[PDB]
Design a protein around this motif. Sequence first.
Motif, PDB file in Angstrom:
ATOM      1  N   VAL A  62       0.824  -1.210   0.000  1.00 44.76           N
ATOM      2  CA  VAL A  62       0.000   0.000   0.000  1.00 44.76           C
ATOM      3  C   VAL A  62       0.857   1.258   0.000  1.00 44.76           C
ATOM      4  O   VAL A  62       0.580   2.168  -0.798  1.00 44.76           O
ATOM      5  CB  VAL A  62      -1.005  -0.031   1.165  1.00 44.76           C
ATOM      6  N   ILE A 122      -6.684   9.084  -2.954  1.00 42.40           N
ATOM      7  CA  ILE A 122      -5.482   8.299  -3.253  1.00 42.40           C
ATOM      8  C   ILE A 122      -5.280   7.211  -2.204  1.00 42.40           C
ATOM      9  O   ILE A 122      -4.995   6.054  -2.533  1.00 42.40           O
ATOM     10  CB  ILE A 122      -4.244   9.204  -3.368  1.00 42.40           C
ATOM     11  N   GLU A 123      -5.421   7.560  -0.925  1.00 38.66           N
ATOM     12  CA  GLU A 123      -5.103   6.561   0.093  1.00 38.66           C
ATOM     13  C   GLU A 123      -6.113   5.422   0.082  1.00 38.66           C
ATOM     14  O   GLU A 123      -5.722   4.257   0.203  1.00 38.66           O
ATOM     15  CB  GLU A 123      -4.990   7.201   1.475  1.00 38.66           C
ATOM     16  N   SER A 124      -7.415   5.722  -0.087  1.00 35.58           N
ATOM     17  CA  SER A 124      -8.401   4.639  -0.097  1.00 35.58           C
ATOM     18  C   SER A 124      -8.298   3.810  -1.379  1.00 35.58           C
ATOM     19  O   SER A 124      -8.453   2.579  -1.339  1.00 35.58           O
ATOM     20  CB  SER A 124      -9.824   5.177   0.096  1.00 35.58           C
ATOM     21  N   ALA A 179      -5.542   3.284  -3.184  1.00 34.99           N
ATOM     22  CA  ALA A 179      -4.348   2.452  -3.057  1.00 34.99           C
ATOM     23  C   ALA A 179      -4.619   1.253  -2.168  1.00 34.99           C
ATOM     24  O   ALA A 179      -4.246   0.118  -2.492  1.00 34.99           O
ATOM     25  CB  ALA A 179      -3.189   3.283  -2.499  1.00 34.99           C
ATOM     26  N   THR A 180      -5.267   1.488  -1.028  1.00 37.54           N
ATOM     27  CA  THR A 180      -5.586   0.400  -0.115  1.00 37.54           C
ATOM     28  C   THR A 180      -6.432  -0.668  -0.797  1.00 37.54           C
ATOM     29  O   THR A 180      -6.175  -1.864  -0.633  1.00 37.54           O
ATOM     30  CB  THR A 180      -6.291   0.968   1.116  1.00 37.54           C
ATOM     31  N   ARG A 193       0.860   9.287  -6.012  1.00 37.39           N
ATOM     32  CA  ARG A 193       1.326  10.660  -5.819  1.00 37.39           C
ATOM     33  C   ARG A 193       2.256  11.078  -6.946  1.00 37.39           C
ATOM     34  O   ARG A 193       2.170  12.206  -7.447  1.00 37.39           O
ATOM     35  CB  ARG A 193       2.032  10.829  -4.466  1.00 37.39           C
ATOM     36  N   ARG A 249       0.513   3.980  -2.910  1.00 44.56           N
ATOM     37  CA  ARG A 249       0.254   5.384  -2.602  1.00 44.56           C
ATOM     38  C   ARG A 249       1.301   6.290  -3.240  1.00 44.56           C
ATOM     39  O   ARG A 249       0.966   7.297  -3.874  1.00 44.56           O
ATOM     40  CB  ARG A 249       0.235   5.597  -1.083  1.00 44.56           C
ATOM     41  N   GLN A 250       2.580   5.954  -3.062  1.00 42.66           N
ATOM     42  CA  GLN A 250       3.653   6.747  -3.654  1.00 42.66           C
ATOM     43  C   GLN A 250       3.516   6.810  -5.171  1.00 42.66           C
ATOM     44  O   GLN A 250       3.691   7.873  -5.780  1.00 42.66           O
ATOM     45  CB  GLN A 250       5.006   6.157  -3.266  1.00 42.66           C
ATOM     46  N   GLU A 290      -3.423  13.036  -0.207  1.00 42.12           N
ATOM     47  CA  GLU A 290      -3.969  11.694  -0.378  1.00 42.12           C
ATOM     48  C   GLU A 290      -5.385  11.532   0.156  1.00 42.12           C
ATOM     49  O   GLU A 290      -5.970  10.452  -0.018  1.00 42.12           O
ATOM     50  CB  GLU A 290      -3.071  10.671   0.321  1.00 42.12           C
ATOM     51  N   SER A 291      -5.945  12.550   0.807  1.00 47.53           N
ATOM     52  CA  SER A 291      -7.251  12.434   1.450  1.00 47.53           C
ATOM     53  C   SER A 291      -8.359  13.157   0.707  1.00 47.53           C
ATOM     54  O   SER A 291      -9.533  12.971   1.046  1.00 47.53           O
ATOM     55  CB  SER A 291      -7.179  12.974   2.889  1.00 47.53           C
TER      56      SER A 291
END
Length: 79
Positions: free
Chosen positions: A6, A70-72, A74-75, A14, A10-11, A30-31
């Motif tokens: 993850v 982005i964070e969700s 990627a997860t 970005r 994420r990276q 990311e949010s």
Amino acid sequence: RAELTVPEMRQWLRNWVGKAVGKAPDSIDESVPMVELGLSSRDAVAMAADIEDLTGVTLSVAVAFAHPTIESLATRIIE
Ligand SMILES: [Ca+2]
Ligand SMILES: [Ca+2]
Ligand SMILES: [Ca+2]
Ligand SMILES: [Ca+2]
Ligand SMILES: [Ca+2]
């Protein structure tokens, strides 16, 4: 430890967004909703293709817009 993680996903997101909008990847939030990042619909098509090349996953509209940050995203791609 071999699989794509993850943090790695994420990276990569970005980096992708930063290049598309002309900003340092470390500055990409990311949010926030990815539709608010300054990406175009053409960017979405290109990013979807790049994600499929990186992960083998063809991202559905349903999955992407149910994980719209982005964070969700990627997860969910990894997990
Ligand atoms: Ca652009
Ligand atoms: Ca710039
Ligand atoms: Ca945050
Ligand atoms: Ca391909
Ligand atoms: Ca799956």
